[PDB]
């Protein structure tokens, strides 16, 4: 039970840690992000921006 | 019978002083490009170490 308790510590620490998110890098109050996220989260097959925010 | 004698002593002391000043001003277009981020990079180190980076 001592060896099983150590595994559950490792197995549960992996479930809590393993959380995925997508990060947008831009200026701290650049409103183009809010319009971008709103379009992306909803349906948006085509989004139009300019070169100063490259998704790569 | 004629005999002659002659002496002479000279002593010259000189002093010089020369002051030179120059200012060569060179105009390179490259030094103009490096002007851009000179003031801006002052507030890129302020931003990273004093302000909140999450919205």
PDB file of N, CA and C in Angstrom:
ATOM      1  N   UNK A   1       0.823  -1.203   0.000  1.00  0.00           N
ATOM      2  CA  UNK A   1       0.000   0.000   0.000  1.00  0.00           C
ATOM      3  C   UNK A   1       0.859   1.254   0.000  1.00  0.00           C
ATOM      4  N   UNK A   2       2.087   1.159   0.509  1.00  0.00           N
ATOM      5  CA  UNK A   2       3.010   2.284   0.422  1.00  0.00           C
ATOM      6  C   UNK A   2       3.457   2.517  -1.014  1.00  0.00           C
ATOM      7  N   UNK A   3       3.653   1.442  -1.778  1.00  0.00           N
ATOM      8  CA  UNK A   3       4.047   1.594  -3.173  1.00  0.00           C
ATOM      9  C   UNK A   3       2.871   2.001  -4.050  1.00  0.00           C
ATOM     10  N   UNK A   4       1.651   1.606  -3.683  1.00  0.00           N
ATOM     11  CA  UNK A   4       0.483   2.037  -4.445  1.00  0.00           C
ATOM     12  C   UNK A   4       0.141   3.491  -4.157  1.00  0.00           C
ATOM     13  N   UNK A   5       0.402   3.956  -2.935  1.00  0.00           N
ATOM     14  CA  UNK A   5       0.102   5.343  -2.599  1.00  0.00           C
ATOM     15  C   UNK A   5       1.024   6.301  -3.337  1.00  0.00           C
ATOM     16  N   UNK A   6       2.271   5.892  -3.575  1.00  0.00           N
ATOM     17  CA  UNK A   6       3.197   6.759  -4.293  1.00  0.00           C
ATOM     18  C   UNK A   6       2.791   6.912  -5.752  1.00  0.00           C
ATOM     19  N   UNK A   7       2.254   5.848  -6.353  1.00  0.00           N
ATOM     20  CA  UNK A   7       1.848   5.910  -7.755  1.00  0.00           C
ATOM     21  C   UNK A   7       0.658   6.845  -7.923  1.00  0.00           C
ATOM     22  N   UNK A   8      -0.314   6.758  -7.014  1.00  0.00           N
ATOM     23  CA  UNK A   8      -1.489   7.620  -7.102  1.00  0.00           C
ATOM     24  C   UNK A   8      -1.099   9.080  -6.950  1.00  0.00           C
ATOM     25  N   UNK A   9      -0.099   9.368  -6.118  1.00  0.00           N
ATOM     26  CA  UNK A   9       0.449  10.718  -6.075  1.00  0.00           C
ATOM     27  C   UNK A   9       0.972  11.127  -7.444  1.00  0.00           C
ATOM     28  N   UNK A  10       1.672  10.222  -8.126  1.00  0.00           N
ATOM     29  CA  UNK A  10       2.204  10.549  -9.442  1.00  0.00           C
ATOM     30  C   UNK A  10       1.109  10.560 -10.502  1.00  0.00           C
ATOM     31  N   UNK A  11       0.141   9.646 -10.403  1.00  0.00           N
ATOM     32  CA  UNK A  11      -0.923   9.595 -11.401  1.00  0.00           C
ATOM     33  C   UNK A  11      -1.866  10.782 -11.265  1.00  0.00           C
ATOM     34  N   UNK A  12      -2.220  11.149 -10.034  1.00  0.00           N
ATOM     35  CA  UNK A  12      -3.117  12.282  -9.843  1.00  0.00           C
ATOM     36  C   UNK A  12      -2.423  13.604 -10.136  1.00  0.00           C
ATOM     37  N   UNK A  13      -1.133  13.714  -9.817  1.00  0.00           N
ATOM     38  CA  UNK A  13      -0.399  14.931 -10.143  1.00  0.00           C
ATOM     39  C   UNK A  13      -0.302  15.138 -11.645  1.00  0.00           C
ATOM     40  N   UNK A  14      -0.472  14.071 -12.427  1.00  0.00           N
ATOM     41  CA  UNK A  14      -0.454  14.206 -13.878  1.00  0.00           C
ATOM     42  C   UNK A  14      -1.797  14.676 -14.417  1.00  0.00           C
ATOM     43  N   UNK A  15      -2.895  14.294 -13.769  1.00  0.00           N
ATOM     44  CA  UNK A  15      -4.209  14.727 -14.229  1.00  0.00           C
ATOM     45  C   UNK A  15      -4.404  16.212 -13.964  1.00  0.00           C
ATOM     46  N   UNK A  16      -4.036  16.667 -12.766  1.00  0.00           N
ATOM     47  CA  UNK A  16      -4.164  18.085 -12.443  1.00  0.00           C
ATOM     48  C   UNK A  16      -3.254  18.934 -13.317  1.00  0.00           C
ATOM     49  N   UNK A  17      -2.017  18.482 -13.526  1.00  0.00           N
ATOM     50  CA  UNK A  17      -1.068  19.241 -14.333  1.00  0.00           C
ATOM     51  C   UNK A  17      -1.509  19.324 -15.787  1.00  0.00           C
ATOM     52  N   UNK A  18      -2.000  18.218 -16.343  1.00  0.00           N
ATOM     53  CA  UNK A  18      -2.276  18.116 -17.776  1.00  0.00           C
ATOM     54  C   UNK A  18      -3.550  18.883 -18.107  1.00  0.00           C
ATOM     55  N   UNK A  19      -3.396  20.194 -18.274  1.00  0.00           N
ATOM     56  CA  UNK A  19      -4.476  21.060 -18.720  1.00  0.00           C
ATOM     57  C   UNK A  19      -3.963  21.934 -19.852  1.00  0.00           C
ATOM     58  N   UNK A  20      -4.694  21.951 -20.960  1.00  0.00           N
ATOM     59  CA  UNK A  20      -4.247  22.589 -22.188  1.00  0.00           C
ATOM     60  C   UNK A  20      -4.948  23.925 -22.382  1.00  0.00           C
ATOM     61  N   UNK A  21      -4.209  24.902 -22.900  1.00  0.00           N
ATOM     62  CA  UNK A  21      -4.775  26.202 -23.227  1.00  0.00           C
ATOM     63  C   UNK A  21      -3.966  26.822 -24.354  1.00  0.00           C
ATOM     64  N   UNK A  22      -4.592  27.761 -25.056  1.00  0.00           N
ATOM     65  CA  UNK A  22      -3.978  28.454 -26.178  1.00  0.00           C
ATOM     66  C   UNK A  22      -3.739  29.906 -25.796  1.00  0.00           C
ATOM     67  N   UNK A  23      -2.500  30.363 -25.944  1.00  0.00           N
ATOM     68  CA  UNK A  23      -2.067  31.663 -25.449  1.00  0.00           C
ATOM     69  C   UNK A  23      -1.891  32.609 -26.628  1.00  0.00           C
ATOM     70  N   UNK A  24      -2.442  33.812 -26.506  1.00  0.00           N
ATOM     71  CA  UNK A  24      -2.280  34.865 -27.497  1.00  0.00           C
ATOM     72  C   UNK A  24      -1.302  35.902 -26.968  1.00  0.00           C
ATOM     73  N   UNK A  25      -0.251  36.170 -27.734  1.00  0.00           N
ATOM     74  CA  UNK A  25       0.751  37.161 -27.367  1.00  0.00           C
ATOM     75  C   UNK A  25       0.531  38.429 -28.181  1.00  0.00           C
ATOM     76  N   UNK A  26       0.398  39.552 -27.493  1.00  0.00           N
ATOM     77  CA  UNK A  26       0.173  40.848 -28.125  1.00  0.00           C
ATOM     78  C   UNK A  26       0.402  41.922 -27.071  1.00  0.00           C
ATOM     79  N   UNK A  27       0.011  43.152 -27.389  1.00  0.00           N
ATOM     80  CA  UNK A  27       0.102  44.232 -26.420  1.00  0.00           C
ATOM     81  C   UNK A  27      -0.919  44.027 -25.310  1.00  0.00           C
ATOM     82  N   UNK A  28      -0.605  44.572 -24.133  1.00  0.00           N
ATOM     83  CA  UNK A  28      -1.354  44.237 -22.929  1.00  0.00           C
ATOM     84  C   UNK A  28      -2.800  44.709 -22.993  1.00  0.00           C
ATOM     85  N   UNK A  29      -3.106  45.745 -23.773  1.00  0.00           N
ATOM     86  CA  UNK A  29      -4.496  46.158 -23.935  1.00  0.00           C
ATOM     87  C   UNK A  29      -4.914  46.229 -25.399  1.00  0.00           C
ATOM     88  N   UNK A  30      -4.255  45.476 -26.275  1.00  0.00           N
ATOM     89  CA  UNK A  30      -4.562  45.510 -27.700  1.00  0.00           C
ATOM     90  C   UNK A  30      -5.920  44.866 -27.941  1.00  0.00           C
ATOM     91  N   UNK A  31      -6.905  45.670 -28.339  1.00  0.00           N
ATOM     92  CA  UNK A  31      -8.263  45.167 -28.503  1.00  0.00           C
ATOM     93  C   UNK A  31      -8.412  44.206 -29.672  1.00  0.00           C
ATOM     94  N   UNK A  32      -7.397  44.065 -30.526  1.00  0.00           N
ATOM     95  CA  UNK A  32      -7.518  43.130 -31.639  1.00  0.00           C
ATOM     96  C   UNK A  32      -7.576  41.688 -31.157  1.00  0.00           C
ATOM     97  N   UNK A  33      -7.100  41.417 -29.941  1.00  0.00           N
ATOM     98  CA  UNK A  33      -7.154  40.058 -29.411  1.00  0.00           C
ATOM     99  C   UNK A  33      -8.587  39.676 -29.071  1.00  0.00           C
ATOM    100  N   UNK A  34      -9.319  40.589 -28.430  1.00  0.00           N
ATOM    101  CA  UNK A  34     -10.684  40.286 -28.017  1.00  0.00           C
ATOM    102  C   UNK A  34     -11.571  39.983 -29.216  1.00  0.00           C
ATOM    103  N   UNK A  35     -11.421  40.751 -30.295  1.00  0.00           N
ATOM    104  CA  UNK A  35     -12.175  40.466 -31.511  1.00  0.00           C
ATOM    105  C   UNK A  35     -11.703  39.171 -32.157  1.00  0.00           C
ATOM    106  N   UNK A  36     -10.414  38.861 -32.031  1.00  0.00           N
ATOM    107  CA  UNK A  36      -9.882  37.632 -32.608  1.00  0.00           C
ATOM    108  C   UNK A  36     -10.413  36.407 -31.876  1.00  0.00           C
ATOM    109  N   UNK A  37     -10.361  36.423 -30.544  1.00  0.00           N
ATOM    110  CA  UNK A  37     -10.827  35.281 -29.763  1.00  0.00           C
ATOM    111  C   UNK A  37     -12.315  35.058 -29.980  1.00  0.00           C
ATOM    112  N   UNK A  38     -13.092  36.141 -30.022  1.00  0.00           N
ATOM    113  CA  UNK A  38     -14.527  36.013 -30.245  1.00  0.00           C
ATOM    114  C   UNK A  38     -14.819  35.343 -31.580  1.00  0.00           C
ATOM    115  N   UNK A  39     -14.115  35.750 -32.637  1.00  0.00           N
ATOM    116  CA  UNK A  39     -14.297  35.098 -33.929  1.00  0.00           C
ATOM    117  C   UNK A  39     -13.831  33.651 -33.884  1.00  0.00           C
ATOM    118  N   UNK A  40     -12.667  33.398 -33.286  1.00  0.00           N
ATOM    119  CA  UNK A  40     -12.104  32.051 -33.291  1.00  0.00           C
ATOM    120  C   UNK A  40     -12.973  31.078 -32.504  1.00  0.00           C
ATOM    121  N   UNK A  41     -13.449  31.489 -31.327  1.00  0.00           N
ATOM    122  CA  UNK A  41     -14.239  30.582 -30.500  1.00  0.00           C
ATOM    123  C   UNK A  41     -15.555  30.232 -31.178  1.00  0.00           C
ATOM    124  N   UNK A  42     -16.260  31.233 -31.689  1.00  0.00           N
ATOM    125  CA  UNK A  42     -17.412  30.953 -32.528  1.00  0.00           C
ATOM    126  C   UNK A  42     -16.947  30.422 -33.876  1.00  0.00           C
ATOM    127  N   UNK A  43     -17.904  30.072 -34.722  1.00  0.00           N
ATOM    128  CA  UNK A  43     -17.551  29.669 -36.065  1.00  0.00           C
ATOM    129  C   UNK A  43     -16.918  30.806 -36.838  1.00  0.00           C
ATOM    130  N   UNK A  44     -15.755  30.559 -37.436  1.00  0.00           N
ATOM    131  CA  UNK A  44     -15.100  31.553 -38.286  1.00  0.00           C
ATOM    132  C   UNK A  44     -14.168  30.834 -39.234  1.00  0.00           C
ATOM    133  N   UNK A  45     -14.676  30.384 -40.379  1.00  0.00           N
ATOM    134  CA  UNK A  45     -13.791  29.745 -41.363  1.00  0.00           C
ATOM    135  C   UNK A  45     -12.677  30.653 -41.853  1.00  0.00           C
ATOM    136  N   UNK A  46     -12.939  31.950 -42.003  1.00  0.00           N
ATOM    137  CA  UNK A  46     -11.958  32.883 -42.542  1.00  0.00           C
ATOM    138  C   UNK A  46     -11.862  34.104 -41.642  1.00  0.00           C
ATOM    139  N   UNK A  47     -10.647  34.418 -41.202  1.00  0.00           N
ATOM    140  CA  UNK A  47     -10.377  35.586 -40.374  1.00  0.00           C
ATOM    141  C   UNK A  47      -9.375  36.465 -41.106  1.00  0.00           C
ATOM    142  N   UNK A  48      -9.598  37.774 -41.053  1.00  0.00           N
ATOM    143  CA  UNK A  48      -8.766  38.739 -41.759  1.00  0.00           C
ATOM    144  C   UNK A  48      -8.027  39.614 -40.759  1.00  0.00           C
ATOM    145  N   UNK A  49      -6.696  39.599 -40.826  1.00  0.00           N
ATOM    146  CA  UNK A  49      -5.857  40.460 -40.001  1.00  0.00           C
ATOM    147  C   UNK A  49      -4.750  41.027 -40.881  1.00  0.00           C
ATOM    148  N   UNK A  50      -3.757  41.643 -40.246  1.00  0.00           N
ATOM    149  CA  UNK A  50      -2.600  42.175 -40.949  1.00  0.00           C
ATOM    150  C   UNK A  50      -1.323  41.551 -40.396  1.00  0.00           C
ATOM    151  N   UNK A  51      -0.191  41.960 -40.969  1.00  0.00           N
ATOM    152  CA  UNK A  51       1.071  41.269 -40.731  1.00  0.00           C
ATOM    153  C   UNK A  51       1.580  41.414 -39.304  1.00  0.00           C
ATOM    154  N   UNK A  52       1.102  42.403 -38.550  1.00  0.00           N
ATOM    155  CA  UNK A  52       1.713  42.694 -37.260  1.00  0.00           C
ATOM    156  C   UNK A  52       1.307  41.719 -36.167  1.00  0.00           C
ATOM    157  N   UNK A  53       0.406  40.784 -36.446  1.00  0.00           N
ATOM    158  CA  UNK A  53       0.119  39.670 -35.544  1.00  0.00           C
ATOM    159  C   UNK A  53       0.099  38.410 -36.407  1.00  0.00           C
ATOM    160  N   UNK A  54       1.237  37.719 -36.485  1.00  0.00           N
ATOM    161  CA  UNK A  54       1.334  36.524 -37.313  1.00  0.00           C
ATOM    162  C   UNK A  54       1.060  35.289 -36.470  1.00  0.00           C
ATOM    163  N   UNK A  55       0.117  34.434 -36.865  1.00  0.00           N
ATOM    164  CA  UNK A  55      -0.248  33.292 -36.013  1.00  0.00           C
ATOM    165  C   UNK A  55       0.880  32.302 -35.790  1.00  0.00           C
ATOM    166  N   UNK A  56       1.915  32.320 -36.628  1.00  0.00           N
ATOM    167  CA  UNK A  56       2.993  31.349 -36.479  1.00  0.00           C
ATOM    168  C   UNK A  56       3.734  31.541 -35.161  1.00  0.00           C
TER     169      UNK A  56
ATOM    170  N   UNK B   1     105.293  93.205 -34.774  1.00  0.00           N
ATOM    171  CA  UNK B   1     104.766  92.035 -34.082  1.00  0.00           C
ATOM    172  C   UNK B   1     103.397  92.393 -33.531  1.00  0.00           C
ATOM    173  N   UNK B   2     102.381  91.629 -33.918  1.00  0.00           N
ATOM    174  CA  UNK B   2     101.003  91.926 -33.558  1.00  0.00           C
ATOM    175  C   UNK B   2     100.353  90.689 -32.963  1.00  0.00           C
ATOM    176  N   UNK B   3      99.770  90.837 -31.778  1.00  0.00           N
ATOM    177  CA  UNK B   3      99.083  89.753 -31.094  1.00  0.00           C
ATOM    178  C   UNK B   3      97.644  90.159 -30.815  1.00  0.00           C
ATOM    179  N   UNK B   4      96.729  89.212 -30.962  1.00  0.00           N
ATOM    180  CA  UNK B   4      95.322  89.481 -30.754  1.00  0.00           C
ATOM    181  C   UNK B   4      94.667  88.417 -29.899  1.00  0.00           C
ATOM    182  N   UNK B   5      93.606  88.827 -29.209  1.00  0.00           N
ATOM    183  CA  UNK B   5      92.794  87.928 -28.405  1.00  0.00           C
ATOM    184  C   UNK B   5      91.335  88.317 -28.569  1.00  0.00           C
ATOM    185  N   UNK B   6      90.446  87.344 -28.388  1.00  0.00           N
ATOM    186  CA  UNK B   6      89.022  87.588 -28.567  1.00  0.00           C
ATOM    187  C   UNK B   6      88.224  86.521 -27.838  1.00  0.00           C
ATOM    188  N   UNK B   7      87.180  86.952 -27.135  1.00  0.00           N
ATOM    189  CA  UNK B   7      86.278  86.060 -26.425  1.00  0.00           C
ATOM    190  C   UNK B   7      84.848  86.343 -26.861  1.00  0.00           C
ATOM    191  N   UNK B   8      83.951  85.416 -26.536  1.00  0.00           N
ATOM    192  CA  UNK B   8      82.534  85.560 -26.846  1.00  0.00           C
ATOM    193  C   UNK B   8      81.757  84.521 -26.055  1.00  0.00           C
ATOM    194  N   UNK B   9      80.631  84.945 -25.487  1.00  0.00           N
ATOM    195  CA  UNK B   9      79.737  84.036 -24.777  1.00  0.00           C
ATOM    196  C   UNK B   9      78.310  84.346 -25.195  1.00  0.00           C
ATOM    197  N   UNK B  10      77.587  83.335 -25.662  1.00  0.00           N
ATOM    198  CA  UNK B  10      76.187  83.478 -26.032  1.00  0.00           C
ATOM    199  C   UNK B  10      75.343  82.574 -25.148  1.00  0.00           C
ATOM    200  N   UNK B  11      74.089  82.959 -24.937  1.00  0.00           N
ATOM    201  CA  UNK B  11      73.168  82.184 -24.112  1.00  0.00           C
ATOM    202  C   UNK B  11      71.753  82.516 -24.555  1.00  0.00           C
ATOM    203  N   UNK B  12      71.121  81.601 -25.285  1.00  0.00           N
ATOM    204  CA  UNK B  12      69.773  81.797 -25.801  1.00  0.00           C
ATOM    205  C   UNK B  12      68.822  80.827 -25.120  1.00  0.00           C
ATOM    206  N   UNK B  13      67.748  81.356 -24.544  1.00  0.00           N
ATOM    207  CA  UNK B  13      66.717  80.552 -23.904  1.00  0.00           C
ATOM    208  C   UNK B  13      65.409  80.744 -24.653  1.00  0.00           C
ATOM    209  N   UNK B  14      64.816  79.644 -25.104  1.00  0.00           N
ATOM    210  CA  UNK B  14      63.610  79.691 -25.912  1.00  0.00           C
ATOM    211  C   UNK B  14      62.487  78.936 -25.219  1.00  0.00           C
ATOM    212  N   UNK B  15      61.256  79.339 -25.514  1.00  0.00           N
ATOM    213  CA  UNK B  15      60.068  78.663 -25.017  1.00  0.00           C
ATOM    214  C   UNK B  15      59.021  78.617 -26.116  1.00  0.00           C
ATOM    215  N   UNK B  16      58.375  77.465 -26.262  1.00  0.00           N
ATOM    216  CA  UNK B  16      57.304  77.283 -27.229  1.00  0.00           C
ATOM    217  C   UNK B  16      56.048  76.839 -26.503  1.00  0.00           C
ATOM    218  N   UNK B  17      54.903  77.049 -27.142  1.00  0.00           N
ATOM    219  CA  UNK B  17      53.637  76.520 -26.662  1.00  0.00           C
ATOM    220  C   UNK B  17      52.690  76.427 -27.843  1.00  0.00           C
ATOM    221  N   UNK B  18      52.099  75.253 -28.041  1.00  0.00           N
ATOM    222  CA  UNK B  18      51.249  75.002 -29.198  1.00  0.00           C
ATOM    223  C   UNK B  18      49.993  74.292 -28.727  1.00  0.00           C
ATOM    224  N   UNK B  19      48.835  74.894 -28.975  1.00  0.00           N
ATOM    225  CA  UNK B  19      47.552  74.316 -28.602  1.00  0.00           C
ATOM    226  C   UNK B  19      46.761  73.987 -29.858  1.00  0.00           C
ATOM    227  N   UNK B  20      46.342  72.734 -29.981  1.00  0.00           N
ATOM    228  CA  UNK B  20      45.602  72.269 -31.141  1.00  0.00           C
ATOM    229  C   UNK B  20      44.239  71.756 -30.706  1.00  0.00           C
ATOM    230  N   UNK B  21      43.223  72.052 -31.509  1.00  0.00           N
ATOM    231  CA  UNK B  21      41.859  71.635 -31.234  1.00  0.00           C
ATOM    232  C   UNK B  21      41.196  71.237 -32.541  1.00  0.00           C
ATOM    233  N   UNK B  22      40.509  70.106 -32.532  1.00  0.00           N
ATOM    234  CA  UNK B  22      39.840  69.625 -33.728  1.00  0.00           C
ATOM    235  C   UNK B  22      38.516  68.990 -33.381  1.00  0.00           C
ATOM    236  N   UNK B  23      37.614  68.968 -34.358  1.00  0.00           N
ATOM    237  CA  UNK B  23      36.305  68.343 -34.193  1.00  0.00           C
ATOM    238  C   UNK B  23      35.870  67.804 -35.546  1.00  0.00           C
ATOM    239  N   UNK B  24      36.110  66.518 -35.779  1.00  0.00           N
ATOM    240  CA  UNK B  24      35.760  65.867 -37.032  1.00  0.00           C
ATOM    241  C   UNK B  24      34.377  65.250 -36.895  1.00  0.00           C
ATOM    242  N   UNK B  25      33.416  65.785 -37.637  1.00  0.00           N
ATOM    243  CA  UNK B  25      32.029  65.349 -37.578  1.00  0.00           C
ATOM    244  C   UNK B  25      31.740  64.494 -38.802  1.00  0.00           C
ATOM    245  N   UNK B  26      31.327  63.252 -38.574  1.00  0.00           N
ATOM    246  CA  UNK B  26      31.108  62.283 -39.638  1.00  0.00           C
ATOM    247  C   UNK B  26      29.633  61.921 -39.696  1.00  0.00           C
ATOM    248  N   UNK B  27      29.064  61.950 -40.896  1.00  0.00           N
ATOM    249  CA  UNK B  27      27.649  61.672 -41.110  1.00  0.00           C
ATOM    250  C   UNK B  27      27.507  60.333 -41.817  1.00  0.00           C
ATOM    251  N   UNK B  28      27.128  59.303 -41.070  1.00  0.00           N
ATOM    252  CA  UNK B  28      26.865  57.986 -41.629  1.00  0.00           C
ATOM    253  C   UNK B  28      25.382  57.675 -41.504  1.00  0.00           C
ATOM    254  N   UNK B  29      24.796  57.147 -42.578  1.00  0.00           N
ATOM    255  CA  UNK B  29      23.370  56.833 -42.559  1.00  0.00           C
ATOM    256  C   UNK B  29      23.092  55.652 -41.639  1.00  0.00           C
ATOM    257  N   UNK B  30      24.095  54.800 -41.412  1.00  0.00           N
ATOM    258  CA  UNK B  30      23.907  53.656 -40.528  1.00  0.00           C
ATOM    259  C   UNK B  30      23.626  54.107 -39.101  1.00  0.00           C
ATOM    260  N   UNK B  31      24.352  55.126 -38.632  1.00  0.00           N
ATOM    261  CA  UNK B  31      24.140  55.616 -37.276  1.00  0.00           C
ATOM    262  C   UNK B  31      22.744  56.191 -37.099  1.00  0.00           C
ATOM    263  N   UNK B  32      22.072  56.533 -38.196  1.00  0.00           N
ATOM    264  CA  UNK B  32      20.704  57.020 -38.087  1.00  0.00           C
ATOM    265  C   UNK B  32      19.732  55.876 -37.835  1.00  0.00           C
ATOM    266  N   UNK B  33      19.974  54.714 -38.445  1.00  0.00           N
ATOM    267  CA  UNK B  33      19.104  53.565 -38.209  1.00  0.00           C
ATOM    268  C   UNK B  33      19.186  53.096 -36.764  1.00  0.00           C
ATOM    269  N   UNK B  34      20.383  53.123 -36.178  1.00  0.00           N
ATOM    270  CA  UNK B  34      20.539  52.677 -34.799  1.00  0.00           C
ATOM    271  C   UNK B  34      19.911  53.644 -33.807  1.00  0.00           C
ATOM    272  N   UNK B  35      19.515  54.834 -34.259  1.00  0.00           N
ATOM    273  CA  UNK B  35      18.816  55.782 -33.399  1.00  0.00           C
ATOM    274  C   UNK B  35      17.456  55.280 -32.946  1.00  0.00           C
ATOM    275  N   UNK B  36      16.810  54.423 -33.737  1.00  0.00           N
ATOM    276  CA  UNK B  36      15.402  54.108 -33.519  1.00  0.00           C
ATOM    277  C   UNK B  36      15.139  53.577 -32.117  1.00  0.00           C
ATOM    278  N   UNK B  37      15.703  52.420 -31.786  1.00  0.00           N
ATOM    279  CA  UNK B  37      15.376  51.738 -30.544  1.00  0.00           C
ATOM    280  C   UNK B  37      16.166  52.268 -29.357  1.00  0.00           C
ATOM    281  N   UNK B  38      16.830  53.414 -29.507  1.00  0.00           N
ATOM    282  CA  UNK B  38      17.660  53.917 -28.418  1.00  0.00           C
ATOM    283  C   UNK B  38      16.813  54.366 -27.236  1.00  0.00           C
ATOM    284  N   UNK B  39      15.729  55.095 -27.497  1.00  0.00           N
ATOM    285  CA  UNK B  39      14.861  55.523 -26.407  1.00  0.00           C
ATOM    286  C   UNK B  39      13.829  54.457 -26.061  1.00  0.00           C
ATOM    287  N   UNK B  40      13.386  53.680 -27.050  1.00  0.00           N
ATOM    288  CA  UNK B  40      12.320  52.715 -26.801  1.00  0.00           C
ATOM    289  C   UNK B  40      12.780  51.601 -25.870  1.00  0.00           C
ATOM    290  N   UNK B  41      13.997  51.092 -26.065  1.00  0.00           N
ATOM    291  CA  UNK B  41      14.486  50.015 -25.212  1.00  0.00           C
ATOM    292  C   UNK B  41      14.636  50.441 -23.762  1.00  0.00           C
ATOM    293  N   UNK B  42      14.452  51.722 -23.454  1.00  0.00           N
ATOM    294  CA  UNK B  42      14.455  52.150 -22.061  1.00  0.00           C
ATOM    295  C   UNK B  42      13.237  51.594 -21.340  1.00  0.00           C
ATOM    296  N   UNK B  43      12.090  51.581 -22.013  1.00  0.00           N
ATOM    297  CA  UNK B  43      10.836  51.152 -21.417  1.00  0.00           C
ATOM    298  C   UNK B  43      10.450  49.733 -21.802  1.00  0.00           C
ATOM    299  N   UNK B  44      11.364  48.970 -22.398  1.00  0.00           N
ATOM    300  CA  UNK B  44      11.132  47.540 -22.545  1.00  0.00           C
ATOM    301  C   UNK B  44      11.648  46.779 -21.334  1.00  0.00           C
ATOM    302  N   UNK B  45      12.640  47.336 -20.635  1.00  0.00           N
ATOM    303  CA  UNK B  45      13.082  46.736 -19.384  1.00  0.00           C
ATOM    304  C   UNK B  45      12.196  47.169 -18.222  1.00  0.00           C
ATOM    305  N   UNK B  46      11.580  48.348 -18.324  1.00  0.00           N
ATOM    306  CA  UNK B  46      10.585  48.749 -17.334  1.00  0.00           C
ATOM    307  C   UNK B  46       9.363  47.849 -17.398  1.00  0.00           C
ATOM    308  N   UNK B  47       8.916  47.525 -18.611  1.00  0.00           N
ATOM    309  CA  UNK B  47       7.700  46.738 -18.776  1.00  0.00           C
ATOM    310  C   UNK B  47       7.876  45.324 -18.240  1.00  0.00           C
ATOM    311  N   UNK B  48       9.046  44.727 -18.461  1.00  0.00           N
ATOM    312  CA  UNK B  48       9.219  43.318 -18.127  1.00  0.00           C
ATOM    313  C   UNK B  48       9.375  43.092 -16.631  1.00  0.00           C
ATOM    314  N   UNK B  49       9.821  44.097 -15.882  1.00  0.00           N
ATOM    315  CA  UNK B  49      10.198  43.891 -14.490  1.00  0.00           C
ATOM    316  C   UNK B  49       9.334  44.653 -13.494  1.00  0.00           C
ATOM    317  N   UNK B  50       8.300  45.363 -13.944  1.00  0.00           N
ATOM    318  CA  UNK B  50       7.477  46.111 -12.998  1.00  0.00           C
ATOM    319  C   UNK B  50       5.976  46.003 -13.215  1.00  0.00           C
ATOM    320  N   UNK B  51       5.494  45.511 -14.352  1.00  0.00           N
ATOM    321  CA  UNK B  51       4.076  45.566 -14.666  1.00  0.00           C
ATOM    322  C   UNK B  51       3.518  44.170 -14.904  1.00  0.00           C
ATOM    323  N   UNK B  52       2.197  44.061 -14.792  1.00  0.00           N
ATOM    324  CA  UNK B  52       1.514  42.790 -14.973  1.00  0.00           C
ATOM    325  C   UNK B  52       1.391  42.463 -16.453  1.00  0.00           C
ATOM    326  N   UNK B  53       1.733  41.225 -16.807  1.00  0.00           N
ATOM    327  CA  UNK B  53       1.790  40.789 -18.196  1.00  0.00           C
ATOM    328  C   UNK B  53       0.580  39.970 -18.619  1.00  0.00           C
ATOM    329  N   UNK B  54      -0.418  39.825 -17.756  1.00  0.00           N
ATOM    330  CA  UNK B  54      -1.656  39.138 -18.095  1.00  0.00           C
ATOM    331  C   UNK B  54      -2.771  40.172 -18.101  1.00  0.00           C
ATOM    332  N   UNK B  55      -3.735  39.993 -18.994  1.00  0.00           N
ATOM    333  CA  UNK B  55      -4.795  40.973 -19.171  1.00  0.00           C
ATOM    334  C   UNK B  55      -5.659  41.112 -17.927  1.00  0.00           C
TER     335      UNK B  55
END
